[PDB]
A paper describes a structure:
The binding of Phe and succinate in the active site of mArAT as observed in the crystal structures of mArAT-PLP-Phe and mArAT-PMP-succinate complexes revealed the molecular basis of substrate selectivity of mArAT. The two liganded structures are virtually identical (an rmsd of 0.28 Å over 305 Cα atom pairs). As seen in the one of the mArAT crystal structure, a dicarboxylic acid, succinate was bound in the active site pocket. Thus, the first choice of molecules for inhibition studies were the dicarboxylate molecules succinic acid and maleic acid, the latter being a well-studied inhibitor of aminotransferases. However, both the dicarboxylates failed to inhibit mHspAT and mArAT.
Therefore, we propose its reannotation of as an aromatic amino acid aminotransferase (mArAT). Contrastingly in mArAT, residues Val86, Phe110, Leu112 and Phe246* form a hydrophobic substrate binding pocket which provides an energetically favourable environment for the specific binding of hydrophobic substrates such as Phe, Trp and the less polar Tyr.
Residue numbers in the entry:
A (entry chain A), B (entry chain B): 1 to 353
Write the structure that this text describes.
């Protein structure tokens, strides 16, 4: 006899992380390539002095720094902080959804969403993409009385694309006002070409809109786990009710504050990533690959049934890229020498096809 | 109109942390008082270089070290790691309980249990203590067909006591074998007087027993959030299914590994805390305070309706102690000079009654 566990656990689609392989360049987790700035390193060591003490459960000084960086329309009451935006995704489910409820999102999208929804006893409504892009029209139509939460992943992980900014505004305006809408903006700092939506204006104009952002990519703290949500104080308060206490570490909070102080410097680096993104995209298309327009720090190769082969052969060339079933491969844009290694491999692989 | 949130959120008993008051003596969060060893800071220093990279989702190195420390009868498959044992408490609830299900625990016990149970839509069965100690007989009598999880907090937070080690074994033997029993051993390193149970023996003897331990107290890493569970590989596999990805940070893992390597030095320090505990207990009793026999790094003062006054008066003396309703005050055993400052206050307060 064994302990009786919940029946939902069997076949639960557990999250599978990007691999780390000795000897290989990693283009599978959308990480930026630079270690911490001197001031960030200093804050980590300063926080290390008092590691025997619990963190601030409320991340008070971080919220004050985030509110200031968000501008005059936002105060700390509009900000929740979580142990990665992955934690905030679960907290959103925990404040909205229970047994038999529905959570709507585009698919393929962040692989985190389905299992977290299922843990709540709710059902994920996975709405197909159109041209590798969230289909807001289709998502709206599938709303029912039991729809408790909607995720819009923008830019989308793993397809890299963004919806039209005006289209997003129309969507939010059309959704029944009682349904929480979470706009996942993990990659927002990489959006160019006038495609960034007025996400903060949407949270101002609508009490049911919450925006998720992260320190893991542009701010370079994927190792330390700081995500934040921007929303209406009632929603922020609810998220803080289900927050697992102390999960955002002291060192994480201090490192995040120091990163905010260096934001001009850190955000300027995204311009370089975007330049490589354009170059990687141009070279891949010149080789004969087709891929959608990326607004993130990665590209999406919809290789279908060939994704497994591409990834295995990439591994043989000491390059780690990220497979998504039989849909495609997500390739991070990183250092120029890593991007060149990937491009050389990609040309060679497609020639062999 | 506001976003519709779950009804269970209204009046949820949200976890209230111990206050942190700059300039005051903090005896409110059961923290140890020493900064990290140079070897631990060095491990953090090395990990700081790659904070741009995600942590190991599987905590492979840490699990291996934990399994070595647990001895020849335990391998990594018996160990789950969480972002604090507080996260593992939620994971336990997530693998066992949903709407209508029951979770039984002694009360007063860990403030964390009721809200996490309610977040699952489950029903907390709160079984009164007897002489400030878990009443295993009464808890057994409360078991039903809907009992999905049992918490035994040993030593108990906040009352500081343990049940008899044989009584614990008999309780485990008498609980129906399909019900998961979690033994919360956050303070196990402080148990003396032959009162420590054979919890690892119980795990080996029973597939439905899981033991929770932490790096936050004896190992002095409260700021960095590492807890671990020891159990049957099926339970561990299940806990890892609901684990929020990457929540145990890269720096936390490195610090925890370093702390295991320095376990002889760190564990030896528990003897000094134990000596202070006996000393403080004698000083309080001589000053007219009754208290149960503590096996933790804190004592429990069953002040009843006077706890608010005691805490307020302590606060005015620049001493932070932890109030629990109209039941009592939990006071951490910390540095000798800090304990003496508290004792001075305690004697003063006593004389004013
Ligand atoms: C859309 C999205 N949201 C959240 C996350 C998780 O980020 P964090 O490291 O802040 O948890 C990811 C990971 N790439 C993502 O793609
Ligand atoms: C019984 C018990 N369990 C778990 C915890 C949480 O410890 P951690 O810091 O590992 O989350 C505490 C905190 N005092 C506790 O008292």
């Amino acid at each position: 006899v064994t302990a009786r566990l919940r029946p939902e656990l069997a076949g639960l689609p557990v999250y599978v992380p990007g691999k780390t392989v000795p000897g290989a360049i990693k283009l599978a987790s959308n990480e930026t390539v630079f270690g911490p700035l001197p001031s960030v390193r200093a804050a980590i060591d300063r926080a290390t002095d008092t590691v025997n003490r619990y963190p601030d459960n409320g991340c008070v000084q971080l919220k004050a720094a985030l509110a200031r960086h968000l501008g005059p329309d936002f105060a700390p009451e509009h900000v929740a902080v979580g142990c990665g935006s992955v934690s905030l995704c679960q907290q959103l489910v925990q404040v909205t959804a229970s047994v038999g409820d529905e959570v709507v999102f585009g698919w393929r999208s962040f692989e985190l969403y389905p299992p977290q929804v299922r843990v709540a006893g709710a059902i994920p409504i996975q709405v197909p993409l159109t041209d590798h892009t969230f289909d807001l029209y289709a998502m709206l139509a599938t709303v029912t009385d039991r729809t408790r939460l909607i995720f819009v992943c923008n830019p989308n992980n793993p397809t890299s694309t963004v919806v039209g900014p005006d289209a997003l505004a129309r969507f939010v305006e059309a959704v029944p006002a009682h349904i929480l809408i979470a706009i996942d903006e993990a990659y927002v700092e990489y959006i160019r070409d006038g495609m960034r939506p007025d996400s903060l204006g949407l949270v101002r104009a609508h009490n049911n809109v919450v925006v998720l952002r992260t320190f893991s990519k542009a701010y370079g703290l994927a190792g330390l786990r700081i995500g934040y949500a921007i929303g209406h104080p009632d929603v922020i308060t609810a998220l803080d009710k289900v927050y697992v206490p102390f999960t955002v570490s002291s060192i994480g909070q201090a490192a995040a504050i120091a990163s905010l102080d260096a934001a001009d410097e850190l955000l300027a680096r995204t311009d370089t990533v975007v330049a490589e993104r354009a170059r990687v995209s141009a070279e891949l298309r010149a080789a004969g690959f087709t891929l959608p327009p990326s607004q993130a720090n990665f590209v999406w190769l919809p290789l279908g049934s060939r994704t497994q082969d591409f990834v295995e052969q990439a591994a043989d060339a000491r390059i780690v890229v990220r497979p998504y079933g039989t849909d495609g491969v997500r390739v991070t844009v990183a250092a120029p020498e890593e991007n060149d290694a990937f491009l050389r491999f990609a040309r060679r692989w497609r020639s062999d096809q």
